[PDB]
Amino acid sequence: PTAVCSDGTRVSNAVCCDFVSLGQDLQSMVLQGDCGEDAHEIIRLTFHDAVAISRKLGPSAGGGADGSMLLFPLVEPEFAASNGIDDSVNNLIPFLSLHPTISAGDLVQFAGAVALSNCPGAPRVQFLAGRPNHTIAAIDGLIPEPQDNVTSILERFDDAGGFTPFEVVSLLASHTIARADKVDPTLDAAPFDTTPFTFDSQIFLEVLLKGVGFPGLDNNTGEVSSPLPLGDTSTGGKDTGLMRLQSDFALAHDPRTACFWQGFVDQQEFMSQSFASAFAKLAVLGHNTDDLIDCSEVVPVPKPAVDKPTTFPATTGPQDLELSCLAERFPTLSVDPGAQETLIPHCSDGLENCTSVQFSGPATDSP
């Protein structure tokens, strides 16, 4: 039956109420209301946790969205494909004992939903609760890597949960709030779009620009040339230049995915809704939803989409596009004024000096 939570939220099931205090603690202790580093890493973790499941190999290969990354932190986080996931894992582990009624699987997905809510333009995602509190570690080899080709990526997502090419591209809207710490051993927080604290369609536009250089080294696995490689890190600054992943480039130009990729350019609501639908499917891999309860009402209302239109970043323009989609014309968009590349801020407040919460814990990472 219905009930009302301590914060006034109307819920269809009183067991949803335990998530209210969890959300509050996730914000006060880790996320700090920001679409920042810790939020981004936690959203990345929802994917690393959930995608480790295989129809063809059967249940023993992995239980999907099951908290396996938190419950066996000495196994999957140290597989090569998850290098760097230790930060999010170690940040979430303490919540298992602080909120002992909430399973690890539920914790991972709820933390991702709360993190998304901090990002202007992000959808208010579905949240179903009730994932069991026990599992085993997944096998290695189930997480796509940025050097993988589109056939491989599409097969992996299809085998994980029957995701279509459209749903894959939709999920990759997440790269609108993403940066890389491990791809280039000389760079920290190399952003994938010019607005890494805004859940917008800049990623879709910017991957379609011609690459002209690299923000760091020119030969990292899984990395390709960037259209906006300039940063201030050569003089000690923290505003790393923009990085492009091979996989994002490949998705943007493959015949199976290129029209879906371009279709999100300057289509904020379509992008956010499409991401939401695919992400809800991702969040329940390893579960029959009949065995879960709807606690969507305790996901915070997200920060609204920004007013700013989708635009070409300074020094770029439509003449720089490499287009592959015949089915839809690329829209006419304004160009941001400026003669030199605009530094991409390291922090959501526009500065370089922000710091992030990091708890110590059992998961580790490699140089």
Ligand code: HEM
């Ligand atoms: C083909 C599939 C994917 C590939 C190859 C891929 C690859 C990557 C890589 C290489 C990084 C940088 C990690 C680092 O070096 O620090 C990254 C970051 C990230 N990924 Fe993706 N990813 C994929 C799909 C997804 C999905 C489905 C989601 C979530 C729905 C996601 C969310 C994120 C987020 C939020 C970050 C940023 C973390 C941060 O900024 O701290 N990724 N991904």
Ligand SMILES: [Ca+2]
């Ligand atoms: Ca898992």
Ligand SMILES: [Ca+2]
């Ligand atoms: Ca963005």
Ligand SMILES: [Mn+2]
């Ligand atoms: Mn790290």
Ligand SMILES: [Mn+2]
């Ligand atoms: Mn990171």
